[model samples]
Target: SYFSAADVYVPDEWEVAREKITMSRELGQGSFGMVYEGVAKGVVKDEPETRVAIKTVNEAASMRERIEFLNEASVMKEFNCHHVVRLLGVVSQGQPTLVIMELMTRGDLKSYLRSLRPEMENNPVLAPPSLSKMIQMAGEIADGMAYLNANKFVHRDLAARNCMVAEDFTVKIGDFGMTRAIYETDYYRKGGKGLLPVRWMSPESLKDGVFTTYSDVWSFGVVLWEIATLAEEPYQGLSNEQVLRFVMEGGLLDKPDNCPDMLFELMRMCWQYNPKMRPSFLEIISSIKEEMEPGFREVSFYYSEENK
Candidate 1:
């Protein structure tokens, strides 16, 4: 559903909750909703006076879509962590569901990466210490994912776009629209072609429509490639059809030039054809943390460049 600013007609009671919710601008978009930066009313123990991201799902969306959106909202509300976006509350104004959340001023890693690429390509400016930043970012994501896995929740779509960074550079996983709560069996039936963003997906997810913690690990690897390459689009040479065929044929993108071997190895492990072979998020976090220590201590580039 396309969400324009005009679509966000919040009721008077919601406005009364806060003196004014100034809708600043559109932040990002998804299949069912659009996110906007705004001054949210009320204060929380952890969050300060204002600053919030309001995700609005179209009221006119189909019943199935609305159910999916509500499921995501409910899942987001249940999760509270430093590395996961905080859901403030839901504003149900007759039909539309407005999900209030913490604002990630820096935006998604995909946009941030694209913004930095031009400067990196130019001679004078150094590319953002994107690799190091990404490693740190990955660690935070792993922490969140591990927590989700521990609670038997599967983040069916884990990618750069689904994750956000705060003003202070804290990484938080957002957009739980594709998440599923695992119960009893490990296998969850996957239906529909909607959530498949082929580039960031795993072979299992792409082929059999299976989503396991291992599939998330595979997506994590793509995210690592994204981090190192300043968030470039994966499989640049292949079409969506080709990507599906390539993945089904056991093909994956070559590691980007800037990516380190250690990170590459982790990515490889995550992309193993056998789901049982992929490492757990906890193990992934520990290994990456150790590998990133040197880079973290050394001079970095996140502060060195600006978007063209």
Candidate 2:
């Protein structure tokens, strides 16, 4: 099998020399291969690579797999939204094709949310985030989706698990991966050869495999539910078939425990059965701004060297 960097036209600015980057311990595994915290020189001008998350392609990848890996970089390169994870560069000139991206220190949102529970034995040094803070994170995700929707891109996957959180609670939507243990446990349903995110999918998507921004909006509602309940699995006791029946038969998830009435009402707007009836991402952002706690809008960022 043969592949050439010339075959792919990743812009010169986004290309990184293979020697410049150094990989560390594995952070997690993705559909491609291991993701790691890495360091690279010469990526950011006048500064160290400032810590990056490197996504690697398996050594045994087929030519098409390699191309698909780079194609995702190509798509990610076009995204300029602050709420979307930044694609710093790509390493196509080397052993493991690598995608260098901004490091989200706290890791993915779902796990972070789960760890915040008061009874969780290994809670982080920080206190559990306030509902206002959690809702603020949701607003940031919706803002990112609004950007994607405006650019005519449909996020085939949208969930707290797919988003990342920074030390200061900044949330950014990250690349799609169905490799989580939770998905293995039950969140995913086998459709042909691929697993479907039956729990987060829109009725239309679950029904016919069709995806659009509206479908993404429906997924956003489930994400809000996840946030409200602090990362409880969606439709907890229901099987995939039960979720399909539940959603299609006009059953919305019960208002999450301790969730605000206004917030739950907003989730209902997103769960409207008809795709067109669902509010757009922009509309969702407007609602958050108007109704979510004022403390969220005035949020300020703080850096921590202890987490370093």
Candidate 3:
């Protein structure tokens, strides 16, 4: 029998489930949660050796934040993200919440880019990716975001560090701790009280605490810049206040050194002052796909082929 995404379910009694898990070394830790790659005896009974990323709330998480963590599991469970990480199941019901999902073999895209250095050229095992391969990673991410946007999800924190590259170099969007599912409206307003990844924030997001799929497109533009420049920090020298000032003044970060003009222009479209002026995810995906695959057609070459 094959396992479907729906067959796995979360039980209210997390107390019993904890005993069944084998917690290996911690994979990562964050303010929102702790992540571990380990085995769960009962849940993935069929694939006992399959590695999984187990997410749990950090010890320092607050009560409200703890609820948000649980909500992430529910949100992840509600959909399928082939280019995004899949939520395998949950191991806990409340604080110190445990969420298990797909494990990214190559880790975050940021680190992956940094590893592709000229110095690494001689090393056979870790040879850096070519420009074409890097472009593939970028295009795949756009397609992934397109899927999420179509499904009514807003990935508030979109960045290279939040996405992962698989062994085959496929990109998958990860870290949905901040991903939210919206209703009726296209945006969500958060209370302006906590620290956000300021450089990735758009002008509208900074001006008003409003986030929409469009705002995500803005962040995606920055992410594309990061990819082109091998994960260089955007507006590297600007302070948060200064970055805010710069964005309000209609200043966009300069094109990354050596980046193609066309790609940089797409990033500009995303930085448009008016959100409506920005292209949708469909547009982003199509542009990148066209750039990656060119001189191809659905049917027009038939006469030329016959003549040949």
Clashes of each: 2, 0, 0
* Residues 1-308, model 3: lDDT tens digits: 88674333346533336655666777666556567777765554467555767778766777667666666467666555457777776755544567777778677887777776456357455444455665666667876787777667788888888788776677888756432221112122334545566678888888876789999999989988888878777887876678877987788988877777777888999999899999987776566664553422221111123212
Lowest-sum lDDT 10-residue window in model 3: 295-304
CA RMSD, predictions in order: 9.8, 6.3, 9.8
In angstroms, the error of model 1 at 183 is: 31
- Across residues 1-308, which tens digit of lDDT does each residue of candidate 2 receive? 89665554454678988888999978987776778998878776688656888999967987678887778667788876667888888888756888898888888888888877777466456654566776788788887787777677888878888898886678888755523554565366557637667888888887788889998999999898988888887888998888888887778888987787767887899899999999988778776675454553443111112111
Give the higher-TM-score candidate: 1 or 3: 1
Writing each residue's lDDT as its tens digit, candidate 1 over 155-200 gives 8778776787789877778756422221112122345644456677
Report lDDT (CA) for all predictions: 0.68, 0.77, 0.69
Question: Which candidate comes out best when scored by lDDT?
Answer: 2
Predicted structure with the largest TM-score when compared to the true one = 2
| Candidate 3 collision pairs | none
